[PDB]
């Protein structure tokens, strides 16, 4: 586009697979960026000969919007609220004017703030101009929930497209994405953008700047502008990127304009973000006709999440939905939001798709990306009010006289109770007396690990735990003038380090300060930290659960991350004669209570660990004594152990209820005390307790009450056909039910339907809600499956989007490109086009890679090559004369890449250099008689490479802290012991060998350290991280890293591609199919991962877990290391010490890695290699052992062998194979080793001069 086309032509054809990609372009292209002005980038727009198919009407009333004055009123407590129209959710960003509550900007006349006078006005008490203030600063908040300025998105969007189609180097033609003169979201954005500006010079109705917003001062601009224009973008780039059906795309449009047509667009999108899923994922194959599906078979002990590929499942009428019908319900949500035009077609649509195959999940992720993907945002005062008020209600409450008198603060339940809480205690009595006889339980470090799992950077409620103390005249060391963020829970640790059980003890009932998050498709998450000695108090609680949830059930550990979320057992449950239910609790929080729940466990708990810890403290708490009227009649006091009294002291919390202080930092005058039975989140049982409760009341149901409630011969049977050992899987809320078919099909859907409403009607006796689905669909940890096809989720994972719930400001740049690197892999794993996919990325890098800094008046300006992303994983589009394309996204990121793409294309970079002038009479086992040192120089790839390793963000009183640490962590005695016999055992066995020794003498450090590194950065300090960046940029290398240059002597011959491990006609993956070549082919030759992540990695350590502050994988590498640099058993022994360990386990653990075989992936960690995050999802372990032959392909050759001593080489030498394979586009293909410059053994001791010279 001219002016488009015009300013980054060069570049536009290095990313498009035209032209080489060079520094000085992307350079040239990044310095075009910064100087786009917003304004341009609308006036690229209007370049665009947009096509009739990419308009549609757009609603006059989204421009002319009323007051936001009846949307707001003062309740009983002063407080601002919002006042209800549209129900009891209407309580969000409400859609009104905006303009004549701001005052133009100084600079920018065209652009205004919230008035001064009204927030003044505001501060001083006034009603009307508290409600103003609380409206504009909530509707900035909502225009802030984004990464960037959009404009810098669509700039990208639009250098890249200018490429047009891509020639796809595997199905050797052209892609049929339509161009953005099709692209609907876009002409919207440029429409309704145009419409507000009207003839105002500036186009860009909004500006996000750093810390607030300011909107274009046209009484056309409405609060529900930003989100509308990010969804739109979203939509803009992934129709482009995802090949997304653009009709689809339209609907989605469709959808967004309403929602900024209603009187609030976050509300809005809240009551219909089910219409895509529901009338697409939800209502497929109402007649299925054909296709395949997955065949796997769940390996023993099903706790392991293992899989197997057996085949696949040819699909018949016989697997048609089964499940209840929707359409009455989807056709009301639609007709009830003005959108029954969008259900039916959608529903139609759906209707025609009677084959399950890659098609048809397209269709359906295609449906689902369309979604809007806002982060909701309303003020903290409503997020409290509706998420901390009302209780459960319990319809079989337990008796009264079920209980004993008091022990203390607790009552013990009856035998002879008929309640079914019966059951919910003896799980837990049963769990708590196990966990409390382990013996590691009384284990030192144990009770360190457990003391130290809540010592982090977070906060941990420090101003009320201060001021709980201060009530009782005990007060804590200030450290006055230490550069330590003291709002953190390591703060907190150092002050009461040398305190006693018994002074700090009233803590335990001090407020708790209110944190926030915003989400996507849904309404803000409360966060609720506890303080450390309630942190500590709890520690029974969360110890039982855990022993619960290994050892009686079937449940998940997951995080956020899809490597993470057992894909495996998705594709299992969903995959046809199999059923899954997605069984849900809502409201758990609320749910779990002093009245049923929380009154059981805690006497439970206290009873059950009674003669394991009979005399004995616990983590730091004392045994004590206490009142006794158990027994009817007498009445004695009883002692109790430090276990026992913790759970004596947590009882008196959870019995209280607790007290939420909220801070409405956006609705002026919005401070108080909230006090409610809703559980804290941020508890280090919150999670695994809900997870116990979950499996434990299953299976009460399954054993008990459902069999009691029903005579129905096949509901009894499907019920005790189920265990939640075998088919309910957990975690949290979550469950998922699987029932596995049988050779006569699928189990009926009228029994199962039965089994379903027994268990609905089973919650509401102890105040759960279950949200039940039956459609045959499966969910799980937030992934949808069906038909054993993963359905990537796009609308969650917005481009744009980005979660900003407090008013801080963003961090400084360049934090934004962590983020940028953090959505280019979100495309990798949720399947986007990978050619449209990396280009974009390209693009949008090169955006965001100028920064201008400012020193006393200098100019100047910090600028990252091209190279540095090529480290942080992103793949080249072509270079050095090579063909374009050739580099796969899965290609790993920093040394163990930058290894695999060079040496993909080694002679070619060689014979680049000399063609070019880089020769020198000095040849070079890698590169020749090629000049690299120079080269590599003035390119500014050595530049990039050292630049892209830096952080990318700003970095007596200290003896007494880290010694306050120091105390907390070292407080049993016999720990310090240990450490200190490892020390004086390191020096004779250890020291020397290897640098890096790992020690809990070393945490206070870290703590401190973390203390620090949480702190507001300092102007200045922000200064000396640019000139670090600078610095790097202006020096000259001759080099890369050592373990670089040492897998540099590596050669291979890639030879036979591999066959399938999988059928080509089985959709694993929406969006990864045979139109997506590079994706698709790497699944289907490597084959999918079939086993859940942190089974297979936790195979990969000798120790799962340990202090928090040290590095599990650390301590496994310095333990690998020292062997492989030959040291002594006794050397490993002491490492083992001076972590915590007992000498009889040190020896012993020790003298077992001495003989042990480690596998590829856990020995790799001697050189810091690492499973790349990309690969998660592939069968990478297969890859590594049966497809890197170390055995050249023509037989033995003597730089190849592997010296007698150096088997450890193999693990190296297996990623580097892999990454070379997995780095080439297309097919997985067998690697063989050829050559090693200066031979293995050679080889091997370059590495071992690496691992000693660590730290050094
Ligand atoms: C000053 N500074 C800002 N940020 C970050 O910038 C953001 C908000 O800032 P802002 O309004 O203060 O920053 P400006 O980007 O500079 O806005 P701006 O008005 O954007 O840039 C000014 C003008 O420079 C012009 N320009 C850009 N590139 C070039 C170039 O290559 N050559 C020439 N001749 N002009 C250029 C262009 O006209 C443009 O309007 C913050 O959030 C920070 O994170 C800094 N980050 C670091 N690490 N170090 C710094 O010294 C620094
Ligand atoms: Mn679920």
Same mark, same amino acid.
């Given at each position: 586009?001219?002016?488009?086309?015009?300013?980054?032509?060069?570049?536009?054809?290095?990313?498009?697979?035209?032209?080489?990609?060079?520094?000085?372009?992307?350079?040239?292209?990044?310095?075009?960026?910064?100087?786009?002005?917003?304004?341009?980038?609308?006036?690229?727009?209007?370049?665009?000969?947009?096509?009739?198919?990419?308009?549609?009407?757009?609603?006059?009333?989204?421009?002319?919007?009323?007051?936001?004055?009846?949307?707001?009123?003062?309740?009983?407590?002063?407080?601002?609220?919002?006042?209800?129209?549209?129900?009891?959710?209407?309580?969000?960003?409400?859609?009104?004017?905006?303009?004549?509550?701001?005052?133009?900007?100084?600079?920018?006349?065209?652009?205004?703030?919230?008035?001064?006078?009204?927030?003044?006005?505001?501060?001083?008490?006034?009603?009307?101009?508290?409600?103003?203030?609380?409206?504009?600063?909530?509707?900035?908040?909502?225009?802030?929930?984004?990464?960037?300025?959009?404009?810098?998105?669509?700039?990208?969007?639009?250098?890249?497209?200018?490429?047009?189609?891509?020639?796809?180097?595997?199905?050797?033609?052209?892609?049929?994405?339509?161009?953005?003169?099709?692209?609907?979201?876009?002409?919207?954005?440029?429409?309704?953008?145009?419409?507000?500006?009207?003839?105002?010079?500036?186009?860009?109705?909004?500006?996000?700047?750093?810390?607030?917003?300011?909107?274009?001062?046209?009484?056309?601009?409405?609060?529900?502008?930003?989100?509308?224009?990010?969804?739109?973008?979203?939509?803009?780039?992934?129709?482009?990127?995802?090949?997304?059906?653009?009709?689809?795309?339209?609907?989605?449009?469709?959808?967004?304009?309403?929602?900024?047509?209603?009187?609030?667009?976050?509300?809005?999108?809240?009551?219909?973000?089910?219409?895509?899923?529901?009338?697409?994922?939800?209502?497929?194959?109402?007649?299925?006709?054909?296709?395949?599906?997955?065949?796997?078979?769940?390996?023993?002990?099903?706790?392991?999440?293992?899989?197997?590929?057996?085949?696949?499942?040819?699909?018949?009428?016989?697997?048609?939905?089964?499940?209840?019908?929707?359409?009455?319900?989807?056709?009301?949500?639609?007709?009830?939001?003005?959108?029954?035009?969008?259900?039916?077609?959608?529903?139609?649509?759906?209707?025609?798709?009677?084959?399950?195959?890659?098609?048809?999940?397209?269709?359906?992720?295609?449906?689902?990306?369309?979604?809007?993907?806002?982060?909701?945002?309303?003020?903290?005062?409503?997020?409290?009010?509706?998420?901390?008020?009302?209780?459960?209600?319990?319809?079989?409450?337990?008796?009264?006289?079920?209980?004993?008198?008091?022990?203390?603060?607790?009552?013990?339940?009856?035998?002879?109770?008929?309640?079914?809480?019966?059951?919910?205690?003896?799980?837990?009595?049963?769990?708590?007396?196990?966990?409390?006889?382990?013996?590691?339980?009384?284990?030192?470090?144990?009770?360190?690990?457990?003391?130290?799992?809540?010592?982090?950077?977070?906060?941990?409620?420090?101003?009320?735990?201060?001021?709980?103390?201060?009530?009782?005249?005990?007060?804590?060391?200030?450290?006055?003038?230490?550069?330590?963020?003291?709002?953190?829970?390591?703060?907190?640790?150092?002050?009461?380090?040398?305190?006693?059980?018994?002074?700090?003890?009233?803590?335990?009932?001090?407020?708790?300060?209110?944190?926030?998050?915003?989400?996507?498709?849904?309404?803000?998450?409360?966060?609720?930290?506890?303080?450390?000695?309630?942190?500590?108090?709890?520690?029974?609680?969360?110890?039982?659960?855990?022993?619960?949830?290994?050892?009686?059930?079937?449940?998940?550990?997951?995080?956020?991350?899809?490597?993470?979320?057992?894909?495996?057992?998705?594709?299992?449950?969903?995959?046809?004669?199999?059923?899954?239910?997605?069984?849900?609790?809502?409201?758990?929080?609320?749910?779990?209570?002093?009245?049923?729940?929380?009154?059981?466990?805690?006497?439970?708990?206290?009873?059950?660990?009674?003669?394991?810890?009979?005399?004995?403290?616990?983590?730091?708490?004392?045994?004590?004594?206490?009142?006794?009227?158990?027994?009817?009649?007498?009445?004695?006091?009883?002692?109790?152990?430090?276990?026992?009294?913790?759970?004596?002291?947590?009882?008196?919390?959870?019995?209280?209820?607790?007290?939420?202080?909220?801070?409405?930092?956006?609705?002026?005058?919005?401070?108080?005390?909230?006090?409610?039975?809703?559980?804290?989140?941020?508890?280090?049982?919150?999670?695994?307790?809900?997870?116990?409760?979950?499996?434990?009341?299953?299976?009460?149901?399954?054993?008990?009450?459902?069999?009691?409630?029903?005579?129905?011969?096949?509901?009894?049977?499907?019920?005790?056909?189920?265990?939640?050992?075998?088919?309910?899987?957990?975690?949290?809320?979550?469950?998922?039910?699987?029932?596995?078919?049988?050779?006569?099909?699928?189990?009926?859907?009228?029994?199962?339907?039965?089994?379903?409403?027994?268990?609905?009607?089973?919650?509401?006796?102890?105040?759960?809600?279950?949200?039940?689905?039956?459609?045959?669909?499966?969910?799980?940890?937030?992934?949808?499956?069906?038909?054993?096809?993963?359905?990537?989720?796009?609308?969650?994972?917005?481009?744009?989007?980005?979660?900003?719930?407090?008013?801080?400001?963003?961090?400084?740049?360049?934090?934004?490109?962590?983020?940028?690197?953090?959505?280019?892999?979100?495309?990798?794993?949720?399947?986007?086009?990978?050619?449209?996919?990396?280009?974009?990325?390209?693009?949008?890098?090169?955006?965001?890679?100028?920064?201008?800094?400012?020193?006393?008046?200098?100019?100047?300006?910090?600028?990252?090559?091209?190279?540095?992303?090529?480290?942080?994983?992103?793949?080249?589009?072509?270079?050095?004369?090579?063909?374009?394309?050739?580099?796969?996204?899965?290609?790993?990121?920093?040394?163990?890449?930058?290894?695999?793409?060079?040496?993909?294309?080694?002679?070619?970079?060689?014979?680049?250099?000399?063609?070019?002038?880089?020769?020198?009479?000095?040849?070079?086992?890698?590169?020749?008689?090629?000049?690299?040192?120079?080269?590599?120089?003035?390119?500014?790839?050595?530049?990039?490479?050292?630049?892209?390793?830096?952080? @990318?963000? $700003?970095?007596?009183?200290?003896?007494?802290?880290?010694? *306050?640490?120091? &105390?907390? +962590?070292?407080?049993? #005695?016999? =720990?310090?012991?240990?450490?200190?016999?490892?020390?004086?055992?390191?020096?004779?066995?250890?020291?020397?060998?290897?640098?890096?020794?790992?020690?809990?003498?070393?945490?206070?450090?870290?703590?401190?350290?973390?203390?620090?590194?949480?702190?507001?950065?300092?102007?200045?300090?922000?200064?000396?991280?640019?000139?670090?960046?600078?610095?790097?940029?202006?020096?000259?290398?001759?080099?890369?890293?050592?373990?670089?240059?040492?897998?540099?002597?590596?050669?291979?011959?890639?030879?036979?591609? @591999?066959? $399938?491990?999988?059928?080509?006609?089985?959709?694993?993956? *929406?969006?990864? &199919?045979? +139109?997506?070549?590079? #994706?698709? =082919?790497?699944?289907?030759?490597?084959?999918?991962?079939?086993?859940?992540?942190?089974?297979?990695?936790?195979?990969?350590?000798?120790?799962?877990?340990?202090?928090?502050?040290?590095?599990?994988?650390?301590?496994?590498?310095?333990?690998?290391?020292?062997?492989?640099?030959?040291?002594?058993?006794?050397?490993?022994?002491?490492?083992?010490?001076?972590?915590?360990?007992?000498?009889?386990?040190?020896?012993?653990?020790?003298?077992?890695?001495?003989?042990?075989?480690?596998?590829?992936?856990?020995?790799?960690?001697?050189?810091?290699?690492?499973?790349?995050?990309?690969?998660?999802?592939? &069968?990478?372990?297969?890859?590594?052992?049966?497809?890197?032959?170390?055995?050249?392909?023509?037989?033995?050759?003597?730089?190849?062998?592997?010296?007698?001593?150096?088997?450890?080489?193999?693990?190296?030498?297996?990623?580097?194979?892999?990454?070379?394979?997995?780095?080439?586009?297309?097919?997985?293909?067998?690697?063989?080793?050829?050559?090693?410059?200066?031979?293995?053994?050679?080889?091997?001791?370059?590495?071992?001069?690496?691992?000693?010279?660590?730290?050094?």
């Amino acid at each position: 586009s001219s002016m488009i086309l015009t300013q980054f032509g060069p570049f536009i054809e290095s990313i498009s697979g035209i032209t080489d990609q060079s520094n000085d372009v992307f350079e040239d292209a990044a310095k075009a960026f910064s100087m786009f002005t917003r304004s341009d980038v609308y006036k690229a727009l209007d370049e665009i000969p947009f096509s009739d198919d990419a308009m549609l009407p757009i609603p006059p009333t989204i421009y002319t919007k009323p007051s936001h004055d009846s949307y707001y009123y003062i309740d009983a407590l002063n407080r601002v609220r919002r006042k209800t129209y549209q129900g009891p959710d209407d309580v969000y960003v409400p859609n009104c004017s905006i303009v004549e509550l701001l005052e133009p900007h100084e600079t920018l006349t065209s652009y205004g703030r919230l008035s001064e006078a009204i927030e003044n006005r505001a501060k001083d008490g006034d009603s009307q101009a508290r409600i103003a203030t609380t409206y504009g600063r909530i509707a900035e908040s909502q225009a802030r929930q984004i990464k960037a300025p959009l404009e810098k998105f669509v700039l990208a969007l639009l250098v890249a497209e200018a490429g047009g189609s891509l020639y796809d180097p595997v199905l050797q033609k052209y892609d049929e994405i339509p161009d953005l003169s099709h692209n609907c979201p876009l002409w919207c954005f440029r429409e309704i953008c145009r419409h507000i500006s009207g003839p105002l010079p500036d186009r860009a109705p909004y500006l996000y700047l750093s810390a607030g917003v300011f909107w274009l001062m046209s009484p056309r601009m409405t609060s529900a502008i930003p989100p509308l224009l990010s969804d739109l973008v979203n939509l803009a780039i992934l129709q482009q990127t995802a090949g997304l059906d653009p009709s689809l795309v339209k609907l989605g449009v469709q959808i967004c304009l309403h929602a900024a047509a209603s009187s609030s667009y976050s509300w809005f999108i809240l009551k219909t973000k089910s219409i895509f899923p529901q009338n697409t994922l939800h209502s497929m194959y109402e007649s299925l006709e054909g296709g395949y599906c997955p065949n796997l078979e769940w390996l023993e002990p099903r706790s392991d999440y293992k899989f197997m590929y057996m085949g696949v499942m040819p699909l018949s009428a016989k697997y048609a939905r089964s499940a209840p019908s929707n359409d009455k319900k989807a056709r009301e949500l639609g007709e009830k939001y003005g959108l029954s035009s969008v259900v039916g077609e959608l529903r139609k649509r759906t209707k025609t798709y009677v084959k399950h195959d890659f098609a048809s999940v397209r269709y359906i992720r295609d449906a689902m990306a369309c979604t809007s993907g806002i982060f909701l945002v309303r003020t903290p005062t409503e997020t409290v009010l509706q998420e901390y008020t009302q209780s459960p209600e319990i319809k079989v409450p337990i008796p009264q006289k079920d209980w004993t008198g008091p022990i203390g603060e607790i009552r013990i339940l009856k035998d002879t109770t008929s309640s079914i809480a019966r059951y919910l205690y003896r799980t837990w009595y049963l769990a708590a007396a196990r966990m409390a006889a382990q013996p590691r339980t009384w284990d030192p470090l144990f009770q360190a690990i457990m003391r130290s799992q809540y010592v982090t950077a977070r906060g941990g409620s420090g101003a009320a735990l201060r001021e709980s103390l201060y009530a009782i005249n005990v007060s804590l060391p200030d450290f006055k003038g230490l550069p330590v963020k003291a709002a953190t829970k390591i703060f907190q640790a150092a002050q009461l380090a040398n305190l006693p059980f018994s002074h700090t003890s009233v803590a335990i009932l001090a407020d708790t300060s209110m944190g926030l998050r915003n989400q996507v498709q849904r309404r803000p998450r409360s966060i609720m930290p506890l303080n450390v000695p309630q942190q500590q108090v709890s520690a029974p609680h969360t110890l039982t659960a855990d022993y619960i949830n290994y050892h009686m059930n079937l449940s998940p550990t997951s995080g956020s991350a899809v490597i993470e979320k057992v894909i495996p057992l998705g594709v299992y449950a969903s995959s046809p004669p199999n059923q899954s239910i997605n069984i849900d609790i809502s409201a758990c929080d609320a749910s779990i209570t002093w009245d049923f729940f929380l009154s059981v466990i805690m006497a439970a708990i206290h009873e059950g660990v009674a003669s394991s810890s009979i005399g004995k403290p616990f983590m730091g708490v004392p045994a004590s004594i206490v009142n006794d009227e158990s027994v009817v009649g007498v009445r004695a006091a009883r002692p109790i152990s430090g276990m026992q009294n913790m759970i004596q002291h947590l009882s008196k919390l959870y019995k209280r209820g607790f007290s939420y202080r909220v801070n409405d930092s956006f609705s002026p005058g919005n401070d108080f005390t909230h006090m409610t039975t809703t559980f804290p989140s941020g508890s280090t049982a919150t999670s695994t307790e809900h997870t116990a409760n979950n499996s434990t009341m299953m299976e009460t149901f399954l054993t008990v009450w459902g069999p009691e409630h029903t005579d129905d011969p096949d509901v009894l049977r499907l019920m005790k056909s189920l265990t939640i050992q075998r088919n309910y899987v957990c975690q949290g809320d979550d469950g998922l039910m699987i029932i596995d078919g049988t050779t006569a099909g699928k189990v009926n859907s009228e029994t199962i339907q039965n089994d379903l409403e027994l268990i609905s009607k089973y919650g509401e006796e102890f105040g759960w809600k279950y949200d039940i689905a039956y459609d045959g669909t499966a969910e799980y940890l937030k992934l949808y499956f069906i038909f054993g096809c993963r359905i990537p989720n796009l609308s969650r994972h917005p481009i744009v989007g980005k979660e900003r719930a407090n008013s801080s400001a963003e961090e400084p740049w360049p934090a934004i490109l962590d983020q940028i690197m953090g959505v280019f892999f979100n495309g990798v794993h949720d399947g986007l086009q990978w050619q449209r996919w990396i280009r974009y990325s390209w693009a949008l890098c090169c955006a965001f890679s100028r920064q201008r800094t400012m020193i006393g008046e200098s100019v100047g300006y910090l600028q990252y090559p091209m190279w540095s992303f090529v480290y942080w994983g992103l793949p080249l589009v072509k270079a050095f004369g090579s063909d374009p394309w050739i580099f796969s996204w899965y290609m790993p990121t920093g040394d163990l890449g930058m290894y695999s793409w060079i040496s993909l294309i080694r002679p070619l970079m060689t014979r680049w250099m000399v063609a070019n002038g880089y020769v020198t009479d000095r040849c070079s086992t890698v590169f020749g008689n090629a000049d690299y040192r120079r080269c590599f120089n003035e390119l500014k790839l050595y530049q990039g490479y050292y630049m892209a390793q830096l952080p @990318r963000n $700003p970095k007596e009183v200290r003896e007494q802290f880290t010694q *306050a640490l120091s &105390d907390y +962590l070292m407080q049993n #005695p016999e =720990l310090k012991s240990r450490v200190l016999r490892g020390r004086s055992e390191w020096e004779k066995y250890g020291a020397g060998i290897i640098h890096n020794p790992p020690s809990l003498f070393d945490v206070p450090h870290k703590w401190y350290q973390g203390a620090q590194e949480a702190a507001i950065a300092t102007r200045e300090e922000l200064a000396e991280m640019d000139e670090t960046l600078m610095r790097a940029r202006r020096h000259s290398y001759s080099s890369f890293s050592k373990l670089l240059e040492a897998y540099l002597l590596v050669k291979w011959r890639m030879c036979e591609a @591999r066959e $399938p491990s999988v059928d080509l006609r089985l959709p694993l993956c *929406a969006g990864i &199919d045979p +139109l997506n070549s590079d #994706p698709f =082919l790497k699944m289907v030759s490597v084959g999918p991962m079939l086993q859940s992540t942190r089974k297979y990695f936790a195979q990969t350590l000798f120790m799962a877990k340990t202090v928090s502050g040290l590095d599990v994988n650390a301590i496994d590498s310095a333990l690998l290391r020292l062997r492989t640099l030959g040291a002594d058993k006794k050397a490993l022994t002491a490492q083992l010490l001076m972590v915590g360990l007992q000498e009889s386990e040190a020896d012993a653990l020790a003298g077992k890695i001495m003989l042990q075989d480690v596998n590829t992936v856990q020995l790799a960690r001697v050189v810091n290699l690492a499973v790349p995050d990309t690969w998660m999802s592939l &069968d990478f372990d297969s890859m590594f052992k049966h497809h890197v032959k170390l055995l050249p392909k023509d037989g033995r050759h003597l730089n190849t062998d592997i010296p007698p001593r150096m088997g450890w080489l193999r693990a190296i030498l297996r990623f580097l194979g892999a990454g070379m394979v997995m780095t080439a586009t297309g097919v997985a293909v067998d690697i063989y080793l050829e050559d090693i410059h200066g031979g293995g053994r050679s080889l091997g001791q370059r590495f071992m001069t690496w691992m000693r010279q660590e730290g050094r």
